[PDB]
Design a protein around this ligand. Structure first.
Ligand SMILES: CC(=O)N[C@@H]1[C@@H](O)[C@@H](O)[C@@H](CO)O[C@H]1O
Ligand SMILES: CC(=O)N[C@@H]1[C@@H](O)[C@@H](O)[C@@H](CO)O[C@H]1O
Ligand SMILES: *[C@@H]1O[C@H](CO)[C@@H](O)[C@H](O)[C@H]1NC(C)=O
Ligand SMILES: *[C@@H]1O[C@H](CO)[C@@H](O)[C@H](O)[C@H]1NC(C)=O
Ligand SMILES: *[C@@H]1O[C@H](CO)[C@@H](O)[C@H](O)[C@H]1NC(C)=O
Ligand SMILES: *[C@@H]1O[C@H](CO)[C@@H](O)[C@H](O)[C@H]1NC(C)=O
Ligand SMILES: *[C@@H]1O[C@H](CO)[C@@H](O)[C@H](O)[C@H]1NC(C)=O
Ligand SMILES: *[C@@H]1O[C@H](CO)[C@@H](O)[C@H](O)[C@H]1NC(C)=O
Ligand SMILES: *[C@@H]1O[C@H](CO)[C@H](O)[C@H](O)[C@H]1NC(C)=O
Ligand SMILES: *[C@@H]1O[C@H](CO)[C@H](O)[C@H](O)[C@H]1NC(C)=O
Ligand SMILES: *[C@@H]1O[C@H](CO)[C@H](O)[C@H](O)[C@H]1NC(C)=O
Ligand SMILES: *[C@@H]1O[C@H](CO)[C@H](O)[C@H](O)[C@H]1NC(C)=O
Ligand code: NA
Ligand code: NA
Ligand code: NA
Lengths: 425, 423, 426
């Protein structure tokens, strides 16, 4: 027997008793595709209005509310909007008197429907609106939601059962060593490679295509707390699932209100009228408390919280040199059931042929070796259907009922609004 | 030396130099019992009423509100209920005029107590209530809570420090190989088995008794996001702990309100009166936003997100063929918890004659030289504890609590009260 | 070859073929410093007042509200406070009539500003306030927040890539065995030690002088350790809060005979109830609060039961495989270290390894691997702060560094605090 340490860096190589070169470092894993992730981005807009508008919507408020921000925020997740009557019509109009602004504004809404909340704000300062011949007319609109910014959306794949692959060249012969397969054939013997433990789970952040790497689950309780993984989750990059912030809490806060000496809490939006430089016009100052107490800057977060390549321990590898030395037909009636890249092992069943043990592959993925006859195995699959099955020789097409990770995420649940009807007696 | 690969499937066996058969595959772990888990199931009921009821409760509203749903939802977690006066009495009655429905309904509540919120809803459409001799009388009741469905409740045990057990038969002799104990004695010489790494933590979902398996923590951010583990947690299968949704937000939403063009958010319940087919009667349409944006279907979720057996790597195993105190321990004391995830303290006196291969109810906790010993061991068995060095056993002294008791240790459960005195 | 099992307890030793003694057990890890953690402690105070106060603040309500609890709760996280007018002035006063208590109390606030919510509570029982010559005058104040108790605050370091270190004395020579480095030289051979797997991630709870307590795992916030401060309030820099935060407490005025009192308040809910005064123009207040997570955490008790004095390791034994297999360069130059330390993101270490062989590179004594002569680039998880002393096993040199601490890393890639925008007039 012989022994030598092999370093893990590019250029690392040993010469005796048989040369072993470190050709590269890669990894194997059982992928769990989480779909799309993004930060919870609280966005707000509105307008200070020297009028009592009759249509509280983006189109109805087009004369005052910024067009593009209104449309974008209106389409956001957990939308909240409030229309406050600061000083209503003293006479005339159409459902515009102060009496139409009862708490909840049902009287105004009866004649002027809106998806927004309507509230009286009498007693709040109307100083922002000036230049009226008689009484001042003033209202305030606020709109907020959690907007999903495309540039802040990342595709995330969780890597489980991670195995560092130490790509070696043993006297010119390729050998890929892992904790699962640490043996290599040498010209006249066997090489057993002592390897460090695997690094545990990895996080693959995909932006578009470039992949960036995290080490861990991630840990939402540590320095990586602002990871999009810890925030908005969309398995199919369309529909939201799981934990969701409450609808934003909108408040009309006058310029001299002592509340302005404090910061808004997460999800809180405070709006303050600004006196107009023009008659019958006014501005609006907005203060919003971001979810998680901070606004995520995606390129900056990725740059500091990820690496260009997956992490691996420093080594070295222990090369143990020894004088020791250790069915090709396709499998039949193979059926694959479950999901792929999902984290739940799929069921692989079929008939292994004669000649010896079938070293079973499913689209080239090693799922184990089986003696001739019926076999059943639970395998974590990384490839989608169709499935080409082999025992190391010719391949055959397996039968499959396999769903994708997004479909798996929606299996066992009934998505959306749950409705019931209470009948009259 | 000799070498051969042994596959890990049933029927796998090698013949030379010494026959080795794969007898089975099992696992060892340090169990962490989480107690009961269930989905957050938002349930809602109510009624559209062409009257101003004087008793806002399930019994008091029995003439309009469905009986069984009211009683069940009333008993739920984080209950919310609202009674809205759409059109009150114009005259007469008993605390039934519009003036009794001030915001918060304190005037109505003085005469007609209720655990529910009471609010005016004047200005909302009263078209659902018709066939009155003079003015219309109308009210709406909504009730919602997080109901725990017994069929949706699962007992969950987290498996940590998992070790795949490769049960071998080496020339008819049983040998259980793991990453911790990879050696088998043979008369030809010692057999060292190269094994793949362990699979990491497992999740055992228990329904009743059958066990189903998950691989991982679980990951609440991936395809298993709807796992009951990610939702309602009751360590003692009675009291709730940790993360809890807010009380449902009940809203009276008229049939033609533009808000109905959007979906309710999680925990939101929108109630809409339905114009009656009969005089002085009306129906109610309810729209509820489930917690997590979807309703969990337990048998279906378990079927797709779990396996019948714990997962293990495919192998093969590397077979390396090489040519290479029994008295019970005394004064043993066990302190802490079992199946909890915090190592218990095991202390005592190892006897003379050699190293004590210490077992606690058959669980290997290590070997100790003669004399005083102290060890921190993750215990899977409950007290009483039988302690042995490999021979005769003795009864240890124990102060060990169960996983539910551990979950409530270091906390004071329930309402916190304080009294501010007059000066 | 020769083989023997070595137990893992203090004193364990084998004599043949080579003496091997178990000297001790320690651990190596890649530290992730999370900063400060504490339970979410909902605290509440208030007063029942037979008057309409004109200054709703701790100082302004000093005649009724307990001084120290008001000041402490006012400084808490997610503060909520409400002032309810139960029975206002019938005449006179200064912005104290019932008409000043419109919903939201904007009319009262015009003359009597406050950071608190102001609401009418007319119709609620005013029985608690008596002894007035004419009409009763009554108001109620409630104040609640999440107070961070210093004695409940713990510094937490997450330990990743954990490696149990089996400290051995092999024929009198120190050998520290791990899953990464399981070989020891024997007088004229080599010892390969078969070791059990590493225990996975650890949690180090740091209190106060300074004492460390240990958890095994992530932790698991869904199991018996659900009340861990790690599952609660997170402050990376022990000053500013980040991530998940409860909503502002929901304050409710609940009369003594309200059927709602037959139920318990939910998490974050605070119910206040006036208590009839034994003295004229005075009243007490009963407060019922629903703690976050359904329970109040008792820190010394939680730590005592949910942690150990030392990190956990498997019981062993170790497999001693004895074999007959046979048993310092110049410092690196132009070395640069970029990223963070004790953060969980590998830092970039680049430089020039000298000629003469492979450089066994150390960064402040931390092993980062071996590199052939010339340019090298590696991603290493660093546990030590800058400055960085770099070596190939001999003399050391000072590396150039742009390395931030764990608290700075926690705030990198985010813009902290209030986000503002201005909507201009058309
Ligand atoms: C289709 C269906 O079951 N709808 C139900 C209805 O039958 C009734 O039970 C009501 C009680 O609130 O809820 C809803
Ligand atoms: C038993 C106890 O301490 N009760 C306290 C009370 O003494 C007082 O401090 C009050 C202040 O809000 O809170 C409550
Ligand atoms: C908002 O959503 C509607 C419906 O999906 C779509 O037609 C419209 O273009 C969207 N607007 C923006 C600005 O995203
Ligand atoms: C090792 O991996 C590389 C890259 O996947 C592959 O080309 C090569 O054939 C592999 N070698 C063996 C022996 O499997
Ligand atoms: C509701 O709870 C009460 C008290 O525990 C019990 O008597 C009653 O049977 C329960 N009703 C339902 C429908 O669960
Ligand atoms: C292996 O495990 C089985 C099942 O627990 C047991 O019956 C058998 O005795 C074990 N063999 C040894 C050598 O411990
Ligand atoms: C409250 O905060 C202020 C400002 O930081 C400080 O001066 C005061 O001492 C604090 N009071 C208490 C009781 O913590
Ligand atoms: C083993 O560890 C101890 C403590 O850290 C150290 O003093 C000793 O030098 C180490 N031995 C070797 C061979 O590295
Ligand atoms: C919920 O309501 C919609 C229409 O609003 C559909 O009728 C749906 O079928 C309803 N579901 C149930 C269970 O009644
Ligand atoms: C909490 O209040 C209850 C009554 O509601 C009991 O009196 C209990 O003893 C209280 N404890 C205190 C004073 O915190
Ligand atoms: C937010 O408002 C503050 C003052 O309240 C500052 O003016 C700050 O620059 C504003 N930010 C933006 C982007 O307008
Ligand atoms: C604030 O938001 C408004 C729209 O709501 C405008 O886009 C304005 O320009 C924003 N402020 C800045 C500085 O970007
Ligand atoms: Na006006
Ligand atoms: Na009426
Ligand atoms: Na009065």
């Amino acid at each position: 027997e012989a022994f030598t340490y092999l370093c893990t860096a590019p250029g690392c190589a040993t010469q005796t008793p048989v040369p072993v070169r470190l050709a590269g470092v890669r990894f194997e894993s059982k992928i769990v595709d989480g779909g799309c992730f993004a930060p919870w981005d609280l966005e707000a807009t509105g307008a200070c209005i020297c009028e009592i508008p009759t249509d509280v919507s983006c189109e109805g408020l087009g004369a005052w509310v910024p067009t593009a921000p209104c449309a974008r925020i209106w389409n956001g997740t957990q939308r909240a909007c409030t229309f406050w009557a600061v000083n209503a019509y003293s006479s005339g109009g159409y459902a515009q008197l102060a009496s139409y602004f009862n708490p909840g504004g049902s009287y105004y809404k009866q004649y002027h429907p809106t998806a927004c909340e309507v509230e009286p704000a009498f007693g709040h300062s109307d100083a922002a609106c000036w230049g009226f011949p008689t009484d001042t007319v003033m209202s305030v609109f606020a709109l907020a939601s959690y907007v999903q910014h495309p540039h802040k959306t990342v595709r995330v794949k969780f890597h489980t059962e991670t195995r560092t692959v130490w790509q070696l060249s043993v006297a010119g012969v390729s050998c890929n060593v892992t904790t699962e397969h640490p043996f290599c054939n040498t010209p006249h013997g066997q090489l057993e490679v002592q390897v460090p433990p695997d690094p545990g789970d990895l996080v693959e952040y995909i932006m578009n295509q470039q992949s960036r790497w995290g080490l861990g689950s991630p840990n939402c309780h540590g320095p990586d707390w602002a990871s999009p993984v810890c925030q908005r989750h969309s398995p199919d990059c369309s529909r939201l699932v799981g934990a969701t912030p409450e609808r934003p809490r909108l408040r009309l806060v006058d310029a001299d209100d002592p509340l302005l000496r404090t910061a808004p809490g997460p999800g809180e939006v405070w709006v303050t009228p600004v006196i107009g430089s023009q008659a019958r016009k006014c501005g609006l100052h907005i203060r919003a408390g971001p979810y998680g107490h901070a606004t995520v800057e995606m390129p900056e977060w990725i740059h500091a919280h990820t690496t260009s390549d997956p992490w691996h321990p420093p080594g070295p590898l222990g090369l143990k040199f020894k004088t020791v030395r250790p069915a090709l037909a396709p499998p039949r009636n193979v059926r694959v059931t479950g999901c792929y890249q999902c984290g739940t092992p799929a069921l692989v069943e079929g008939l292994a042929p004669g000649g010896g043990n079938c070293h079973l592959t499913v689209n080239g993925e090693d799922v184990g070796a089986f003696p001739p006859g019926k076999f059943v195995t639970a395998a974590l699959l990384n490839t989608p259907p169709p499935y080409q099955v082999s025992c190391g020789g010719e391949s055959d097409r397996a039968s499959a009922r396999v769903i994708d990770p997004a479909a798996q995420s929606f299996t066992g649940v009934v998505y959306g609004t749950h409705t019931t009807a209470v009948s009259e007696t």
